[PDB]
Structure formats: C-alpha cells, structure tokens
C-alpha cells in the first residue's frame, strides 16, 4: 500500500513510458512507484501487481490500449555505401545480421502480403536491443529494430530504413489492471489522460 | 572464424563495453558474437562460457578498470532543496534506487560506512530508467560514475555529498584455462 507495482516490456520501457512515468511522479511526489522491466509477461500474475504494460493482447483483465510499434530493418548509410543493398527479404542470408531478443526470429511481411522468415545466426546477438541498436549505428550490418526506440536516427539520418516494403506486423501496448486503491486509481487516471 | 559467447554486467555493457565489442567486430568480420548482459555474475558456470566480463572478484583473471557510484542529482532538484551535508540527511530528501543499488553502502574517505535503505521515490531493477528520473529532478540516486560521464562533464547532473562513495571496485575480464578466435578476443580487450 506504500509503493505502486508496475510492470513494463524490456527494450520499450525508456522510450515509451519513462516520459509518462516521469510526469506522473513529478505531479505525485507522494506517490512511490516500483518498476520492474519484464522480459515477457505472459507468465506473470496479475494478483501481484497493480498495473502491467504489455505487447500485445493477453484474461479477465481492464485491457487499454495505448500505443503501437512496428518493427523495421535499418542499417547505417556506411553499411548502405559499402555494399549493395537487399531488394529482396531472402537477400538478408547474404549480409551481416544483427539480432536482439525478442527479436532473433524475422518474420517479415510485405506490402502484398508475403511472409518470410529469417533465422540466420547474427554477426551479433544479444539479449538486449539498445546494444544491438549501437553496433548498428557504427556499420556492422542490418538489424530489425522497433520504430519508437530508432525514431531520431531515421529522422536524422544516421540510420536508414532498408528493405521498406518489408517489416514485422505491428503489435499494440496495453495497460492491464486487477475495491481498487486511491494511488493506483490515480495512476491509471493519468496515464489514460496523457 | 567461429563463434564467441560473452556475458557483461547489465548496467554497465552500452557505454562501456560496446564501444570495444563494435571495434572487434569491425576488425574481424568471420567472427560472431554472442552477448548476454547478466545481473549476477555469480549465477553463471564459467564452462557455459568464451570470456566474462565481471565487476568485482570472482580462472584466470584480468583487471580491465575500475567503476564508483557516486550520488547524484540534477540543477533543478538542487535549486529546490537544501542538499544534505552529512549521509545520514539522505532521509530527508526523495531517493532514486535501481538495482543492484537499491542497498547504499556509503563510504567516506576515512572509511566510516553509513547505510541508507529508505523506499525511494522511485525504485527500478535498472539503473538507466532510474537516471532518467534523476535528470528531471526527482531526487537524488546512486549512480556509476562511468554511467554518466556526459552529463557530470556539464553539469546536468551534480555531484552531491563529494566525500561520500559505495566502495569502489574492479572490472575483471576472466577466461579459463584455447580457440583462436578467443585469444584474438582477450588480446584486443587488453591493448584497448
């Protein structure tokens, strides 16, 4: 009753929630908030936590949905000047990979519907993506990253979107809950009124 | 040339490891790596394992630097508060705490410890979403020094209580007692 128990996705929790969390603690300097980052909270219990942010649909639970993601292939413009690029989702056999989880299994789809699956061994391979997001930045090769976590390289330019027909279906973030306490209520308030 | 399985500390690996895994990558192309950032280093069986990158002491062992974590705050939050002069007037202000840092064994320069284990503000098993916290202002925390370089370099972040630190300690490349891919690995670590 002294602490908040929230649980949010691994590699997205920086980007798409820090900026939420901070506000809300900012208006709340009452409030105290335990963060856990989960890996997959398919296995987690609900009756242990107050509120849980999640990739994809999961139960009896209060579902919100707040926000999508898209995964996209990106490479640095010194990889894309140093060889020739794929034109082809199977040309990626061809080229330096790098893979971090969840996502060391490709399943990419294009525009007319066509689903290829790449899972060749990366030049790197890591349980974390913001590694795998920095090998990327100095020429290693093409990796397949959410959009949220690379939004100002591409808006830059330090990395390029390659193989544009190309990407992993969206998912969409929810926020799940459950009489319920003040805190948390006011909480869930903030984050729907954000 | 073959595959190379490492395991890095999960604080520390982004700013201070990739900068020499990307620069070993670049020089051998034919050589894979696999990277697993971990919270305990002693929950691994070295056999499972190419090189391991450690904090602190653990078969064969090599000290590759050293890292402290030093209590920390933005502008905005010293601006705001009266910023404590002695450890023990940590409970009077609002606290940053990310895992494996949720206990502060504080030091002084004289050896004297003072341990602070109030619920923080904000309490996270990873110490990049507590700095976050901490560059908006929401209290102080304890931090890697190594992990904020950019921002005690301007300022953005303010070092509080200066006499005051967790026990600094050692970062160990460790291996066993060989591949030619992995000496090639531990030869380049050490000439970084």
């Given at each position: 009753?002294?602490?908040?128990?929230?649980?949010?996705?691994?590699?997205?929790?920086?980007?798409?929630?820090?900026?939420?969390?901070?506000?809300?603690?900012?208006?709340?300097p009452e409030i105290n908030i335990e963060l856990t980052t989960?890996?997959?909270?398919?296995?987690?219990?609900?009756?242990?936590?107050?509120?849980?942010?999640?990739?994809?649909?999961?139960?009896?639970?209060?579902?919100?949905?707040?926000?999508?993601?898209?995964?996209?292939?990106?490479?640095?413009?010194?990889?894309?000047?140093?060889?020739?690029?794929?034109?082809?989702?199977?040309?990626?056999?061809?080229?330096?990979?790098?893979?971090?989880?969840?996502?060391?299994?490709?399943?990419?789809?294009?525009?007319?519907?066509?689903?290829?699956?790449?899972?060749?061994?990366?030049?790197?391979?890591?349980?974390?993506?913001?590694?795998?997001?920095?090998?990327?930045?100095?020429?290693?090769?093409?990796?397949?990253?959410?959009?949220?976590?690379?939004?100002?390289?591409?808006?830059?330019?330090?990395?390029?979107?390659?193989?544009?027909?190309?990407?992993?279906?969206?998912?969409?973030?929810?926020?799940?809950?459950?009489?319920?306490?003040?805190?948390?209520?006011?909480?869930?308030?903030?984050?729907?009124?954000?």
């Amino acid at each position: 009753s002294g602490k908040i128990k929230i649980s949010t996705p691994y590699n997205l929790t920086k980007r798409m929630m820090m900026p939420m969390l901070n506000g809300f603690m900012s208006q709340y300097p009452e409030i105290n908030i335990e963060l856990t980052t989960e890996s997959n909270a398919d296995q987690l219990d609900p009756t242990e936590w107050d509120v849980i942010f999640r990739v994809g649909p999961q139960s009896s639970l209060i579902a919100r949905k707040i926000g999508s993601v898209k995964d996209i292939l990106v490479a640095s413009p010194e990889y894309v000047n140093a060889h020739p690029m794929p034109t082809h989702a199977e040309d990626l056999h061809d080229h330096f990979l790098l893979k971090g989880h969840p996502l060391l299994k490709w399943t990419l789809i294009n525009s007319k519907g066509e689903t290829v699956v790449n899972v060749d061994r990366g030049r790197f391979q890591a349980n974390a993506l913001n590694v795998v997001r920095s090998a990327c930045s100095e020429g290693l090769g093409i990796t397949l990253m959410p959009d949220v976590m690379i939004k100002e390289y591409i808006a830059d330019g330090s990395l390029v979107r390659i193989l544009p027909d190309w990407s992993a279906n969206p998912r969409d973030i929810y926020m799940l809950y459950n009489h319920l306490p003040e805190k948390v209520r006011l909480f869930i308030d903030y984050v729907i009124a954000y």
